[model samples]
Target: MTGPKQQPLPPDVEGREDAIEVLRAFVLDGGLSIAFMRAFDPEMWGLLLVDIARHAARSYARESEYTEDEALERIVEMFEAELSR
Candidate 1:
């Protein structure tokens, strides 16, 4: 099974440097989870990650100690660590 037929990235968003980098990092971090889930538990993939992103976005939005770039970097780093496990 596939994800909920993901939409293509918007033209402006597709190549935006930061968004690109962030997306690359996210995929690198979550690639295994995505593939595994899709193979064995596909139905949960889209909603699970989307909800996670939304919750993380709200956390980033309210955070004052770190800028957006810093937050993204931290999130990426944390993901890398998690992926190592």
Candidate 2:
């Protein structure tokens, strides 16, 4: 099969750097501190009841019309460590 859009986007508004940078910024959100951690850290995040509560506390601190199960699975992801390419 042939590859499509080898440049990843059709950024012709003014320059292409902003285009890639924009994509990078968006993907960076997916990585989410969460953005940077690909699971290996000097301190592994062991579970603590307080952080669970704290997470629950702060987590409700945001929203985005998340889908049925996907939102929760992400919270589960935190305990499981980061999982994204």
Candidate 3:
């Protein structure tokens, strides 16, 4: 539950104070956005967590190995927002 660390701002996104604050807090807490967002609906939170896991897996497996299921699921996630209500 640590707050954001203060730092010199990034060059291109200087004006985005709100976004900068949120992202800074997020990183400062070491990617605990989900832990903080638990007050939201549980199903939505789970879906977001799975999506993050998928993204991390892809990043970890970059130029290495990913199962066919992982490849297909990444595509599924890519189109999920568009196709899902």
Order of candidate numbers by lDDT, starting with the best: 3, 1, 2
Best by TM-score: 3
Report the lDDT tens digits of candidate 2 across residue range 1-85.
4642233444465564443221222324356321233334233344343345456544554554554345556566674575452
TM-score for all models, in order of appearance: 0.34, 0.23, 0.35
Query: Cα deviation in Å at residue 41, candidate 1?
Result: 6.5
Pairs that clash in candidate 2: 31-34, 31-35, 32-35
Which window of ten consecutive residues has the lowest lDDT sum in model 2?
A: 19-28
Q: Can you give the lDDT of residue 9 in candidate 3?
A: 75
Candidate 1's residue-wise lDDT over 14-82, tens digit each? 767664222312244446323232123455556666566556755895776876556666766786699
Which should have the higher TM-score, number 1 or number 3?
3
- The stretch of ten residues in a row with the least summed lDDT in candidate 1 is 32-41
Which portions of model 1 show Cα errors greater than 4 Å? Answer: 1-47
Q: What range of 10 consecutive residues in model 3 has the weakest lDDT sum?
A: 20-29
Sorted on TM-score, best first, the list reads 3, 1, 2
Choose 1 or 2, whichever is better by lDDT: 1
